[PDB]
Amino acid sequence: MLKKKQLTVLDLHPGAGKTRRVLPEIVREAIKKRLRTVILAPTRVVAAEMEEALRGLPVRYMTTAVNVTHSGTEIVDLMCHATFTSRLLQPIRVPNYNLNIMDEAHFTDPSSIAARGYISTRVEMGEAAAIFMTATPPGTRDAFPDSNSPIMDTEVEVPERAWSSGFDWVTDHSGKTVWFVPSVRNGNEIAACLTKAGKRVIQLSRKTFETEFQKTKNQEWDFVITTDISEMGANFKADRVIDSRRCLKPVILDGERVILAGPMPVTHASAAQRRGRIGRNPNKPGDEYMYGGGCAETDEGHAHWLEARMLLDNIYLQDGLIASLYRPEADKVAAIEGEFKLRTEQRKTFVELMKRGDLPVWLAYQVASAGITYTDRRWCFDGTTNNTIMEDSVPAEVWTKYGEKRVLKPRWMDARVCSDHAALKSFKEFAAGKR
Numbered sequence: 496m497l498k499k500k501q502l503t504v505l506d507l508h509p510g511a512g513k514t515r516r517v518l519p520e521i522v523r524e525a526i527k528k529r530l531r532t533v534i535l536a537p538t539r540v541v542a543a544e545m546e547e548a549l550r551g552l553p554v555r556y557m558t559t560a561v562n563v564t565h566s567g568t569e570i571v572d573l574m575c576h577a578t579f580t581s582r583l584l585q586p587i588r589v590p591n592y593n594l595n596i597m598d599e600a601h602f603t604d605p606s607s608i609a610a611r612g613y614i615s616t617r618v619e620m621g622e623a624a625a626i627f628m629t630a631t632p633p634g635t636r637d638a639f640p641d642s643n644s645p646i647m648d649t650e651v652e653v654p655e656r657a658w659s660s661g662f663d664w665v666t667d668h669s670g671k672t673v674w675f676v677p678s679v680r681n682g683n684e685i686a687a688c689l690t691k692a693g694k695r696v697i698q699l700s701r702k703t704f705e706t707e708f709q710k711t712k713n714q715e716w717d718f719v720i721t722t723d724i725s726e727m728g729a730n731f732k733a734d735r736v737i738d739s740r741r742c743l744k745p746v747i748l749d750g751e752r753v754i755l756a757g758p759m760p761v762t763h764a765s766a767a768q769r770r771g772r773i774g775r776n777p778n779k780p781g782d783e784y785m786y787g788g789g790c791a792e793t794d795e796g797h798a799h800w801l802e803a804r805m806l807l808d809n810i811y812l813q814d815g816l817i818a819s820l821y822r823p824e825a826d827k828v829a830a831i832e833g834e835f836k837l838r839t840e841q842r843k844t845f846v847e848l849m850k851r852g853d854l855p856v857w858l859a860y861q862v863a864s865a866g867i868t869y870t871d872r873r874w875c876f877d878g879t880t881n882n883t884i885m886e887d888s889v890p891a892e893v894w895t896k897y898g899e900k901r902v903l904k905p906r907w908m909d910a911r912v913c914s915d916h917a918a919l920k921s922f923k924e925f926a927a928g929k930r
């Protein structure tokens with residue numbers, strides 16, 4: 496694998512030991528061969544599990560998620576997918592790694608897609624080797640891959656709202672269930688319904704994942720209600736998955752606004768990863784996968800692939816060259832390569848709107864490409880009436896940094912800034928000049 500110009504897809508089935516058995520073998524060989532290596536974890540939770548798998552190996556953990564004291568001499572770096580892409584974007588030196596290992600390489604967040612595009616382009620140029628570790632590579636059509644133990648697969652109507660009757664099988668179960676929902680708001684309704692029925696429920700989503708994931712180890716629970724973030728190597732001691740088979744798809748409308756379309760079917764890769772949370776123990780056959788819908792290729796035209804092009808257009812590679820997306824996922828977007836390349840000062844604004852601003856890539860780009868500076872929040876209030884953000888069925892209002900109460904009416908409307916209470920609270924803080 497470790498040879499220049501090689502990209503290997505390590506596509507062993509879910510639970511086959513890619514992280515705990517194969518990765519340490521690859522890292523030992525890399526260190527022996529004096530290959531400057533990067534390992535990319537999707538989340539801090541996985542970064543901490545990798546330290547356990549790699550313990551005793553000389554690895555520099557470029558994350559506060561790992562409390563270890565480094566030799567200072569390590570030639571293997573470990574960081575999150577997003578950290579890698581972030582550093583490429585910023586005026587910070589990133590080694591031209593000889594070996595690029597991406598764990599959970601199916602992750603479809605924009606920074607992950609961009610990282611795959613950058614790495615696969617360096618491999619294509621003959622500069623680097625890469626290993627993409629995932630059971631579900633891009634364009635996989637298999638929702639039912641192999642497992643460590645047999646799984647009971649059942650197609651069944653899954654509730655997506657509070658219920659009173661008709662779903663006894665949900666609550667009659669005496670084990671532990673991981674339930675994939677299409678949104679935080681949908682999970683909140685199901686969680687409230689299960690709690691009312693006497694169940695102990697933990698909710699996971701991207702913003703809460705590190706804190707709340709620890710509760711799956713520290714407290715007894717009956718249900719975990721999670722969004723798609725638990726497709727990225729989240730492990731549970733569960734005997735059932737309930738899968739809505741539904742997700743939200745961010746869609747850019749008329750290059751003007753972003754909607755959260757759906758819910759709509761998941762990809763085959765997503766369904767396989769959801770299912771792959773169970774069947775992991777060869778001594779515990781008969782874990783259950785209950786699924787409420789079919790699969791479809793809902794990544795086609797999904798905003799994450801356009802946002803990945805916005806990131807990759809702004810990453811230096813060589814002179815004026817621009818990294819291409821990883822070939823198997825390159826047709827998911829219809830962008831003109833280079834169309835999002837920003838001049839130095841607009842690029843800095845773009846980066847800051849994403850890092851400190853915590854704005855979606857698309858929205859960060861619209862603001863930066865308009866020549867607006869990071870702290871200039873006038874755009875949050877001067878949009879069309881149809882861009883009015885609502886809070887409890889009335890227009891959302893903030894006090895501006897001038898101390899004037901104004902309706903939130905952004906010039907560019909991205910549904911992700913108000914998809915749940917936490918998102919809207921954050922965007923209100925942004926519009927008010929509070930970060």
Ligand SMILES: CC(=O)Nc1ccc(CC(N)=O)cc1
Pocket residue numbers: 747750751796797798801827828829830857
């Ligand atoms: C947002 C923007 O300024 N331009 C844009 C380019 C291409 C597309 C189509 C696609 N899904 O690939 C959508 C939007």
